[PDB]
Amino acid sequence: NLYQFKNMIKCTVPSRSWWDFADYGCYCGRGGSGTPVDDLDRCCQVHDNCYNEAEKISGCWPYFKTYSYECSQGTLTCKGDNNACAASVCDCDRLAAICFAGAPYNDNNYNIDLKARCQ
C-alpha cells in the first residue's frame, strides 16, 4: 500500500523525502507520458507499468493492498506470506525503491511543466 511504498523508499534513500519523488519527471506522479527525462524518471515508468500488470489480478488494488516485506540495512525483501496480489505489488515497490537509490536526483527535473516536456 501507499505508506509501505513510502517506507521502502525510506529504507533505500533515507536522505530524501517522499515528496521529492512524488512530482518528479514525466512519470513519478499521477500518470505519465512522453519519454522519461532521466534514469530516475525511468524508474517511475517501470513502476507505473508494473502496477498496470498487478491490476490484472482481480481485486488487486496496488495503493490499497497491504503486503509483508522487510527492510534490513538498505536491502528490501517481500516475504513468503504474501498472496499473489500482495506479492506482485510488493515486488513492484521494492524494485522501484532500489532503482531510486541508484539514480542521480536532478533538481531541474522536479515539478516540470508536463505540457512542454512529456508528449
Next chain:
Amino acid sequence: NLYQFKNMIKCTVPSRSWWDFADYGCYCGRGGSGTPVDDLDRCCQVHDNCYNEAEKISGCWPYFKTYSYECSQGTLTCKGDNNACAASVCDCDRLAAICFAGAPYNDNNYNIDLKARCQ
C-alpha cells in the same frame, strides 16, 4: 471505491485511460466550480454531487467503500448484496462511467487553467 470506479470506466470507455478523465474540465478533478465546460465535465459535476449525497449516510466514505458490481461486455450492474452506502456509491460511479462513454472528449479541455474558466 476509487479503483472500482477506475475499472467501471475501463468497462465503458476501454479506449481512454483514467488520467484522461482525472484532470478534465472544471469538475472531473479534485472539487469543481463554475459552469461545466461541456457534456463530459457535466458528467463529472453530476458525479461530484452524487458523492455529496452519498456522504450523508453515516460513515459512507465513497473513495474507500468497496461495493459489488459486474462488468459484462461494456455493461455495468451494481449487484444487490451491498449495503446502503455501497449501493449508493456503486450507482454514482455506474452512472458516471455510462455518461463518460456517451460524451465527446474535447482534448482542448484537458487540464484547463481553472482560474480563467471555472468562475
Next chain:
Amino acid sequence: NLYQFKNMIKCTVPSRSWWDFADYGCYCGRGGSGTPVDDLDRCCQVHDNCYNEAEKISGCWPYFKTYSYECSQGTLTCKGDNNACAASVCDCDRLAAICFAGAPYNDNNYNIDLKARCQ
C-alpha cells in the same frame, strides 16, 4: 482518516468547503515546501509535520487510520477509546481544524503557482 479530517473541518469552519483548503498556499496540498504564505498555510505546515511524527508508529497510516472523536458545536475532542496511532492522528487533525477556524482565508492564496512562490 481523510473523511474524518474533512468532517472535523466541517465542525470548526462550517462555511467553507474542503476544497478551499485542499489547494491552498505552499502546504495545504500534497507535500509542501517553502515559506508558509500566511497563517492558514502555517496551519497546514504544522499538520504535515504532525503526520510525519504520527507515521513513526509502525503501521500508523494517517489518511487510512479511523479514529474516534466528538464534534460538540464547534469544539472537537479525540475520545479515549483510540489506540496510540488513532489518538495521534486524531490530535493532528483536531489541532489543524481548530487552527483553520482562527486564520483569515486569502482568496489570492488559493491554488497558487507553487513554482514561483514555494521553493
